[PDB]
Design an enzyme around this catalytic site. Sequence first.
Site, PDB file in Angstrom:
ATOM      1  N   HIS A  75       0.824  -1.205   0.000  1.00 22.53           N
ATOM      2  CA  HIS A  75       0.000   0.000   0.000  1.00 22.53           C
ATOM      3  C   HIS A  75       0.858   1.256   0.000  1.00 22.53           C
ATOM      4  CE1 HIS A  75      -3.824  -1.831   0.076  1.00 22.53           C
ATOM      5  NE2 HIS A  75      -3.858  -2.176   1.351  1.00 22.53           N
ATOM      6  N   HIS A 117       2.256   1.913  -3.386  1.00 24.70           N
ATOM      7  CA  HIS A 117       1.191   2.397  -4.259  1.00 24.70           C
ATOM      8  C   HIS A 117       0.948   3.886  -4.042  1.00 24.70           C
ATOM      9  CE1 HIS A 117      -3.234   1.882  -5.805  1.00 24.70           C
ATOM     10  NE2 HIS A 117      -2.466   2.549  -6.650  1.00 24.70           N
ATOM     11  N   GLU A 147      -6.786  -3.545  -2.854  1.00 29.53           N
ATOM     12  CA  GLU A 147      -6.046  -4.621  -2.212  1.00 29.53           C
ATOM     13  C   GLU A 147      -5.185  -5.412  -3.186  1.00 29.53           C
ATOM     14  OE1 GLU A 147      -5.814  -4.965   0.966  1.00 29.53           O
ATOM     15  OE2 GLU A 147      -7.194  -3.282   1.292  1.00 29.53           O
ATOM     16  N   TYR A 181     -11.429  -7.999  -0.777  1.00 29.54           N
ATOM     17  CA  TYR A 181     -10.163  -8.677  -0.511  1.00 29.54           C
ATOM     18  C   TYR A 181     -10.024  -9.927  -1.370  1.00 29.54           C
ATOM     19  CZ  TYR A 181      -9.496  -5.688   3.606  1.00 29.54           C
ATOM     20  OH  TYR A 181      -9.315  -4.619   4.451  1.00 29.54           O
TER      21      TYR A 181
END
Lengths: 6, 665
Positions: B464, B467, B489, B599
């Site tokens: 994350h 990103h 995710e 998810y």
Amino acid sequence: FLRRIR
Amino acid sequence: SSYTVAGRNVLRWDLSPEQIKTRTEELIVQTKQVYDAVGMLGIEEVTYENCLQALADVEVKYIVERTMLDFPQHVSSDKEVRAASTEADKRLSRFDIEMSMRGDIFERIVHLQETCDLGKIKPEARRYLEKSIKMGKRNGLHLPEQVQNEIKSMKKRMSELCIDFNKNLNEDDTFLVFSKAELGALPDDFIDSLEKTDDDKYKITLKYPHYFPVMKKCCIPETRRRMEMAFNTRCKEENTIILQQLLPLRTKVAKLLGYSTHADFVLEMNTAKSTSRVTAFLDDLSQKLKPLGEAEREFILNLKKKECKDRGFEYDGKINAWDLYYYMTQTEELKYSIDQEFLKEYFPIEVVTEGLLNTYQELLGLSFEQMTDAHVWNKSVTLYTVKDKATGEVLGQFYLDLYPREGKYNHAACFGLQPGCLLPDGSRMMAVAALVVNFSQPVAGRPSLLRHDEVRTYFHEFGHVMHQICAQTDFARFSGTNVETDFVEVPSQMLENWVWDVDSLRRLSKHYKDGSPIADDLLEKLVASRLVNTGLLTLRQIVLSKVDQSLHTNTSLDAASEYAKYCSEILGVAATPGTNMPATFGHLAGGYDGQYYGYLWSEVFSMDMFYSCFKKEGIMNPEVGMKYRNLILKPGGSLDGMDMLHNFLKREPNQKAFLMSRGLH
Ligand SMILES: [Cl-]
Ligand code: NA
Ligand code: NA
Ligand SMILES: [Zn+2]
Ligand SMILES: [Zn+2]
């Protein structure tokens, strides 16, 4: 905000 | 400058409660000044510069200043700072609703998209206009006045309910007291870290570093049972009341907007598109996992029956909620020879951090540097600067907040603190992220030693972070991780695959005492153990996904009863009577409402990319790594998720890799 799996 | 770092991080972490309150009022006054000026413009006077650019400029200025106000509630060790930060979040969330429902703004952006020549503006600007109009209709701005007012007052009520829901869980301080005998099978390095009571017993909290080791390793069934009851009754009274208001409010708002359910309302903004697609996905996956769950439950029952006979305990013939993790842990040790407490000796936190940073350096062409004497919100937080390896461009910074403490966010999360978007003066803002986890602290004269599941969590959250850091967009609302919820995710779960590779694991591990590597045989067993307990572990996630869909589909449903229904029908492990897991389900109030399926949905995409591209051509290949950065991370939310997947795969994704990685199909 981003969370992880529970 | 894009090649410097000084002055590009404007975040301050030394605000007093009074300053947080003062800054909140100043931010609201100044931000409302911009929206008022745009609203005062004549409808025939609006232009790209006085309308679109003016709103884009205030969005980046507002979101950055908002971060300094609403972030401290998650990390500050001062409870008064956390309380002032929560109040600022409540006030700014109500202000966000007020500005988002200004009809004068909506009328002028609609007129701008209709009159301006879209061909002569950048595609992300066209996306800004269409998404802004879409958000307006999703706020009912095309509907009569009194239904807008009804939606507004309901949305304001919901924002405070969600904030209170998570605030209650974040500040809960439930603890239990157990004797040494009642904590049997737990290791000394764990027991010698607990506070003692006046009767020479030990205090155990409900935090993850306490709850998980007890549920996985404590051989006293009553101890595990008391912990599970307390863990799944946190905030039972107050959060049930919140759910009893929040869920009907979500339904009533969706109805006014024209949607049949809240689930339908949120699914429209996801790659899954529709609830019938989510149901078919979960239901078909549940059917494929059914035989694995039956076999795993059978083996667990045999383990429990033997242990009850060996230890002289009563055997009730069922797998209780407080038995699942304990015997899943035994399954890992027995079938795959994996002892997490021995394996952690090879993952000291500094070695894991070093190898994690080196993995991105080599794979995505980045450079990392730790900053000294960094301005941080807690003494244990570290700060790193990220540069592009080839050009030296400073892409962003991230904080590492790795250890638990009083008042700190209990779960594991990544926070976007500054967006990597354009600034009014034309320059580019440096992205800023924060990784917030609760890993085992250093005990018994040893460094912090991470279990392999903690290493996987570390990699998940760092995905994350990268990103957020690598994403560069024109507008803040498309920056960082502002992608579809069932797509965000993908980068996190993608990086996890690097903790299941033998050669990668060899680079991440080093015995804390003699620096020796993990034995080859143990490395092979660790990788081959990836699918242990996958049947019940995945079925549990399907239960959570189904409960989330149901609670946002049917109206007059008891959340606890709906959870217990899916626990029995799908997982085969009954919910403990008297508990209320949904009252602790923070995702329902943290932006994952009706979207928890994301998810598993994302995992199909990440698995397809890892198998079809990285594993096929070497998982350290910098060319495939750079293609991943540019096509998946760099666009942020300026492109649709399915478009980015198609650009990377050069085809549409499928479940072959996902099913193959699960031992299915
Ligand atoms: Cl700046
Ligand atoms: Na014992
Ligand atoms: Na490829
Ligand atoms: Zn995540
Ligand atoms: Zn799918």
